[PDB]
Design a protein around this ligand. Structure first.
Ligand SMILES: N#Cc1ccc2c(Oc3ccccc3OCCn3ccc(=O)[nH]c3=O)cc(F)cc2c1
Lengths: 539, 401
């Protein structure tokens, strides 16, 4: 008998201030009992468990569904913390031959720490409880133990390292119970090396036996292409919250290869959630959204594998309403993968910022998947980005990129002047409101004598401070200077939004666009600054 | 050669921080470097029974193509026991010149406490999660950890004793993996003395604090003021009144009476000029009752002025600046804002280390995601300061310009 190579055990301790778990055993039918006895007998014969006695005051419950189901819940609550994302098909490199090997009895092939075996003790209840139950303890990694996956993974890695080092002409990916071996060698050489590998694993006592296409982790992996497993979108005349969560989940999962997937109109229904039972109707926007998603999921789309000798390209398109979509490819019309980005929750925003955020996301995802930053094709002029990042108060950066002309293009809708405008009218604006009656006034006075004060019901100080500016923008020429004492309004306008949730701000923006030159000045309030008439909006 | 027992703070477990994505080249560099370090007994591979992890990445120092390994020991440092205290050499900032040296190579001689090693655990990440990350833990003193210079203080004292008994006028400070050497010599004599000290360290950045001082609050000097000019002046003075007691603007605001065009020239009355003059005299004086509290945090705010110009203020209490400055330096960064910001944060942190002995907490004018995505690509320091993100445009931007 050839000695199977010794696998060094991993020292496991319980969390400090705790001892081995002690839970009683539940009553089982005689069928279950007999089944468990028959199982544990041959399990003992194979050396996976061992008989113990009353010297071990620790015990964990066990059921049967035959299949033995040991519950290590409390032991998991007592076991220490261990270390330890799935690989993405798009990042995988095209190989000529790929073998899938699933090791049988994965956990049962790895020895448990001998000083910890005493805590994995369980008891099979004898018939009618007229005898003390049969006592057992685990000598290997228990199914359902907290530390089993990490220890098995580390063991597998330690075993695989020399074969990998000795075989640089083949690539190995390790994932849980499975090893995946790819090579560009001839099929005979490949099969030979696979047999060599499983022999090398047999030396440590690991038994290995699927063919393409591989159904793995929601993916369909073909020899030359990859995709997702068919998405099942239920059609109900009565939707619930949980159904919307499932739907959005599946849409998200499908959106990694299917371009154009929108999920905003379905995600807006998930505010005021945590009630899993409800009936929420859909808007025409949401119905058309879901119908368009069915339109995209009508015909299957596939993605290709990664080739290191070619550039990595990511192209972005604006989808409207905070939605952005992107495609990552190397060759034209042949995507590695696709994706989407939704704007963050904010009161004010613009296109350039959202595009930037999107670029950041794609960069991080790319560095994760391929280990490099892709070149970007963005719907924004070089001069636009130039002006933006040069006149922006914040620091901002986008990696190597080029302008692609596929509308709608991201542009700057208005630019405030840096200095006061000569020959332009000067609107001293102001607004105020009563805190109690919600009655306010908003308006302006100019150097040419032009005045205006508008009375407003149901309003606040900030709303009037904005309203005055809006009034100044309405009744002024193509060029205009505006003076205000509102740090709030200036704070908003300096953030340069092209879209807002407040209609007033949106209208101010729409007014700004129609202008040629706009200089916005600021002054301290109540400092007796003439022109800045606070007394005109206080009456 | 003898390990000193090191523990953690009461009621604090070791650091469990997520390792962030790394590019392929950095991963290669880390693999090579850590292989070499493994062969030298500096670090060792660990099993899955080590649940602790500290972020790690690769950089490239000034005037060097060789990749360097940098560890983000921030969480471990703040979880590491407070090592006890040598008073900060206040004569260091007063010296004519100060040179920074990297004595990190000396730490790899002293072995680390065996029980404490499991807290210095880190992981080299794999691309696309195709294989489990490589796990290491330090056997010797790890660079970046605050306990390393504290442990090596005695050794460093015994080493630098002859040089300090030789040149008592040369001030020596130590922060993390860096050694600061201040003198009043000449740049040539300075460089030769630095060669002398570095070979002195062998057998066992040129800063100029004299050129770095504190800047005041100035007001424009014109012959003809416009309405806009006077308005900006009034805003700046009103803002400055939070810092200085006697700033008044009523006589200047009196000039803005009526509704005039912003570009219209207004002549200054005598009272207005008097008031402006008095305000100048007030602004020329320093700030009243401004002290440094070692028990409080240092706050550093940075504002982007544009055209490569940045401004910064270090303080502890609002409107009580301990330091002010303006980083206009341009090297290779012309087209990149984030690089400029990174270099600025580095310099400010350096000066902060020189002056007070510790690093400040930054308030950066940048979106979290942008910074978090690109700051490591331009980082060259061995230490790492704390930071938060201000995403609301400050009005005071042009008041420091
Ligand atoms: N069931 C299953 C499963 C199967 C394979 C997985 C996987 O293949 C590889 C493993 C080792 C080296 C190269 C590999 O492939 C790269 C791309 N690639 C994929 C399939 C194919 O048929 N051809 C081809 O070129 C990598 C992986 F990360 C997970 C895998 C999972």
């Amino acid at each position: 008998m050839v000695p199977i190579s010794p696998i060094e055990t991993v020292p496991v301790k319980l969390k400090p201030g705790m001892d081995g778990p002690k839970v009683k055993q539940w009553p089982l039918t005689e069928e279950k009992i007999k089944a468990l006895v028959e199982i544990c007998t041959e399990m003992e014969k194979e050396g996976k468990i061992s008989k113990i006695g009353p010297e071990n005051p620790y015990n964990t419950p066990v059921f049967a569904i035959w299949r033995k189901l040991v519950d290590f819940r409390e032991l998991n609550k007592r076991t220490q913390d261990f270390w330890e994302g799935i690989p993405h098909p798009a990042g995988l490199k095209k190989k000529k031959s790929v073998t899938v090997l699933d090791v049988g009895d994965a956990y049962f092939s790895v020895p448990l720490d001998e000083d910890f075996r005493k805590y994995t003790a369980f008891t099979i209840p004898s018939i009618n409880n007229e005898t003390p139950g049969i006592r057992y303890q685990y000598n290997v990694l228990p199914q359902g133990w907290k530390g089993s996956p990490a220890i098995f993974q580390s063991s597998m890695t330690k075993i695989l390292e020399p074969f990998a080092a000795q075989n640089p002409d083949i690539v190995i990916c390790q994932y849980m119970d499975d090893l995946y071996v790819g090579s560009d060698l001839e099929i005979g050489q490949h099969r030979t090396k696979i047999e060599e590998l499983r022999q090398h694993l047999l030396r440590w006592g690991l038994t290995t036996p699927k063919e393409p296409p591989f159904l793995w982790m929601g993916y369909e992996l073909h020899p030359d292409k990859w995709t997702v497993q068919p998405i099942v979108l239920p059609e109900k005349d009565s939707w619930t919250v949980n159904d919307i969560q499932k739907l959005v989940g599946k849409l998200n999962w499908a959106s990694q290869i299917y371009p154009g997937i929108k999920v905003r109109q379905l995600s807006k229904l998930l505010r005021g959630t945590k009630a899993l039972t409800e009936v929420i109707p859909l808007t025409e926007e949401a119905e058309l959204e879901l119908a368009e998603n069915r339109e995209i999921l009508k015909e299957p789309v596939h993605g290709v594998y990664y080739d290191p000798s070619k550039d990595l390209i990511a192209e972005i398109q604006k989808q409207g309403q905070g939605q952005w979509t992107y495609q990552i490819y190397q060759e034209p019309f042949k995507n590695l993968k696709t994706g989407k980005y939704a704007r963050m929750r904010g009161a004010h925003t613009n296109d350039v910022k959202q595009l930037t955020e999107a670029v950041q996301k794609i960069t991080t995802e790319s560095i994760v998947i391929w280990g490099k930053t892709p070149k970007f094709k963005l719907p924004i002029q070089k001069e636009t980005w130039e002006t933006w990042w040069t006149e922006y108060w914040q620091a901002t950066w986008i990696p190597e990129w080029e302008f692609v002309n596929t509308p709608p293009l991201v542009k700057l809708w208005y630019q405030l002047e840096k200095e006061p405008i000569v020959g332009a009218e000067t609107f001293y604006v102001d607004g105020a409101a009563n805190r109690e009656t919600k009655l306010g006034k908003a308006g302006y006075v100019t150097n040419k004598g032009r005045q205006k004060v508008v009375p407003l019901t149901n309003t606040t100080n900030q709303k009037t401070e904005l309203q005055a500016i809006y009034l100044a923008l309405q009744d002024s020429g193509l060029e205009v200077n505006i003076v205000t004492d509102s740090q709030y309004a200036l704070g908003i306008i300096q953030a340069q939004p092209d879209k807002s949730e407040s209609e007033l701000v949106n209208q101010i923006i729409e007014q700004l666009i129609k202008k040629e030159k706009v200089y916005l000045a600021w002054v301290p309030a109540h400092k007796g600054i003439g022109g800045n008439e606070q007394v005109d909006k206080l009456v | 050669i003898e390990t000193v027992p090191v523990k953690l703070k009461p009621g604090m477990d070791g650091p469990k921080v997520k390792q962030w994505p790394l590019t392929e080249e950095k991963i290669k560099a880390l693999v090579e470097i850590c292989t070499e370090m493994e062969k030298e007994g500096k670090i060792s591979k660990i099993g899955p029974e080590n649940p602790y992890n500290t972020p790690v990445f690769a950089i490239k120092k000034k005037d060097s193509t060789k990749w360097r390994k940098l560890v983000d020991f921030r969480e471990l440092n703040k979880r590491t026991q407070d090592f006890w205290g040598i008073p900060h050499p206040a004569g260091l900032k007063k010296k004519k010149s100060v040179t920074v040296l990297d004595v990190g190579d000396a730490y790899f001689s002293v072995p680390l406490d065996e029980d404490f090693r499991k807290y210095t655990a880190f992981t080299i990440p794999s691309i696309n999660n195709e294989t489990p990350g490589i796990r290491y833990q330090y056997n010797v003193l790890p660079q970046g950890w605050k306990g390393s210079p504290a442990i090596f203080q005695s050794s460093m004292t015994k080493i630098l004793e002859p040089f300090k008994k030789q040149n008592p006028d040369i001030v020596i400070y130590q922060y993390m993996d860096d050694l600061y050497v201040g003198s009043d010599l000449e740049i040539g004599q300075h460089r030769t003395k630095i060669e002398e000290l570095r070979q002195h360290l062998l057998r066992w950045y040129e800063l100029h604090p004299d050129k770095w001082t504190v800047q005041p609050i100035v007001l424009p000097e014109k012959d003809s003021w416009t309405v806009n000019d006077i308005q900006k002046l009034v805003g700046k003075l009103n803002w400055a009144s939070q810092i200085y007691p006697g700033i008044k603007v009523r006589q200047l605001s009196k000039l803005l009476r009526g509704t005039k065009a912003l570009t219209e020239v207004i002549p200054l009355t005598e009272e207005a000029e008097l008031e402006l003059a008095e305000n100048r005299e007030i602004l020329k004086e320093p700030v009243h009752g401004v002290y440094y509290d070692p028990s409080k945090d240092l706050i550093a705010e940075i504002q982007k002025q544009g055209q490569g110009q940045w401004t910064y203020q270090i303080y502890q209490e609002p409107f009580k600046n301990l330091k002010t400055g303006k980083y206009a330096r341009m090297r290779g960064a012309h087209t990149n804002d984030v690089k400029q910001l990174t270099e600025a944060v580095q310099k400010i942190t350096t000066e902060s280390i020189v002056i007070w002995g510790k690093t400040p907490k930054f308030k950066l004018p940048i979106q979290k995601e942008t910074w978090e995505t690109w700051w490591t690509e331009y980082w060259q320091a061995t230490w790492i300061p704390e930071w938060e993100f201000v995403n609301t445009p400050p009005l005071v931007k042009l008041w420091y310009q």
